[PDB]
Amino acid sequence: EQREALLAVTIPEEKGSFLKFCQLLGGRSVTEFNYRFADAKNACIFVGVRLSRGLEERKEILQMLNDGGYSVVDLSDDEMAKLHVRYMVGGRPSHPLQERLYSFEFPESPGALLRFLNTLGTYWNISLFHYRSHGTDYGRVLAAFELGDHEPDFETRLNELGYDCHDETNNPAFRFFLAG
Amino acid sequence: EQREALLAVTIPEEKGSFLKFCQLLGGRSVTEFNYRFADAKNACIFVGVRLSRGLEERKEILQMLNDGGYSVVDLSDDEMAKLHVRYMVGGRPSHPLQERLYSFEFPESPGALLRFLNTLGTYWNISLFHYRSHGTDYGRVLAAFELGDHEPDFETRLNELGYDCHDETNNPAFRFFLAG
Numbered sequence: 405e406q407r408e409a410l411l412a413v414t415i416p417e418e419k420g421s422f423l424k425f426c427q428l429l430g431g432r433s434v435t436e437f438n439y440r441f442a443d444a445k446n447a448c449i450f451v452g453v454r455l456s457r458g459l460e461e462r463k464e465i466l467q468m469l470n471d472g473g474y475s476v477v478d479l480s481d482d483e484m485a486k487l488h489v490r491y492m493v494g495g496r497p498s499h500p501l502q503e504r505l506y507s508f509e510f511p512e513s514p515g516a517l518l519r520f521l522n523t524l525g526t527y528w529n530i531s532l533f534h535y536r537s538h539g540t541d542y543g544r545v546l547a548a549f550e551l552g553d554h555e556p557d558f559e560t561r562l563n564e565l566g567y568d569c570h571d572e573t574n575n576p577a578f579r580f581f582l583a584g
Numbered sequence: 585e586q587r588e589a590l591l592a593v594t595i596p597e598e599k600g601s602f603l604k605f606c607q608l609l610g611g612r613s614v615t616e617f618n619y620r621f622a623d624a625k626n627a628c629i630f631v632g633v634r635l636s637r638g639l640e641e642r643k644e645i646l647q648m649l650n651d652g653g654y655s656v657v658d659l660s661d662d663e664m665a666k667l668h669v670r671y672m673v674g675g676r677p678s679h680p681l682q683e684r685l686y687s688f689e690f691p692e693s694p695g696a697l698l699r700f701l702n703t704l705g706t707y708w709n710i711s712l713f714h715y716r717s718h719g720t721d722y723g724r725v726l727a728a729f730e731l732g733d734h735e736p737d738f739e740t741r742l743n744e745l746g747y748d749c750h751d752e753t754n755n756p757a758f759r760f761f762l763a764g
């Protein structure tokens with residue numbers, strides 16, 4: 405019956421961590437991810453999952469995450485998550501960051517988001533990540549990459565690969581609400 | 585044609601400010617508000633508005649806010665606001681707060697949210713506010729109130745008035761994602 409799981413997952417706050425977490429979720433129909441840098445050691449990920457086998461599948465995913473070494477809080481029956489908090493996760497980082505923001509899109513197919521994430525390169529730390537794909541023929545990603553000794557320059561390479569990459573660092577909605 | 589405005593408004597970060605701002609918006613069909621304490625002097629409000637007269641009404645609201653002394657950035661045509669940022673506003677406060685969180689609900693009628701806000705009392709500073717009402721027979725509010733010399737105690741009074749008030753301070757979704 406229930407068609408959506410809402411999950412609060414802790415993953416380590418380190419480069420490559422999100423990719424490893426998404427690899428464990430590979431067989432599942434994730435429809436939302438949301439993250440912003442907050443705690444220096446442990447990152448918090450909001451996950452929305454489309455279910456086809458209801459509570460059986462919800463329990464499988466919870467068990468898989470625990471067996472894989474991730475902590476998860478199940479928010480699937482949490483009225484505040486359903487009515488409010490699923491629209492409020494993320495916000496501003498815990499301190500000001502030097503970061504470059506990009507948007508991307510791709511047609512949905514099995515594994516499409518994971519193939520996209522593998523192209524980014526774990527050299528870059530991710531300081532903001534939002535994905536949404538609800539039945540829409542295209543998945544949508546907004547992600548910020550933290551500057552190190554140099555800045556990321558993704559547009560040409562990612563456009564070549566079909567991912568419709570745009571620099572959003574000066575986007576007014578980002579600047580007004582999410583910047584540090 | 586266009587049926588929704590998305591607005592980024594600056595209001596002063598002081599007690600009673602949100603009520604004054606909502607009073608100016610009184611004749612409009614607001615469907616979303618989202619705010620979290622961030623800057624000490626100027627608060628940022630995300631507003632979603634249902635339109636029945638399209639761009640004419642969008643322009644009326646923008647002009648009304650400027651004429652009333654509020655700064656507004658129009659995000660109604662901003663693709664990042666539409667696809668991403670409208671799900672990411674709010675987050676954690678800029679520093680840790682002593683605050684009590686409550687949820688409320690009421691049947692929608694003209695002016696219902698404003699009648700509700702007048703009952704709260706501008707004695708309390710609001711440090712988190714989320715409202716959503718999209719065609720649903722009931723409007724939904726989640727709000728945090730900052731502690732001073734004593735703590736707020738709203739349940740009995742607000743339940744008497746019909747507002748279905750619950751203390752959400754220990755809600756798992758709030759604790760995991762939005763707490764300071």
Ligand SMILES: CC[C@H](C)[C@H](N)C(=O)O
Binds near residue numbers: 416421
């Ligand atoms: C979600 C991002 C995670 C926490 C990490 N910053 C990464 O780059 O993989």
Ligand SMILES: CC[C@H](C)[C@H](N)C(=O)O
Binds near residue numbers: 598601603619627710
């Ligand atoms: C949105 C809340 C505003 C900024 C103020 N803190 C108030 O209590 O009215």
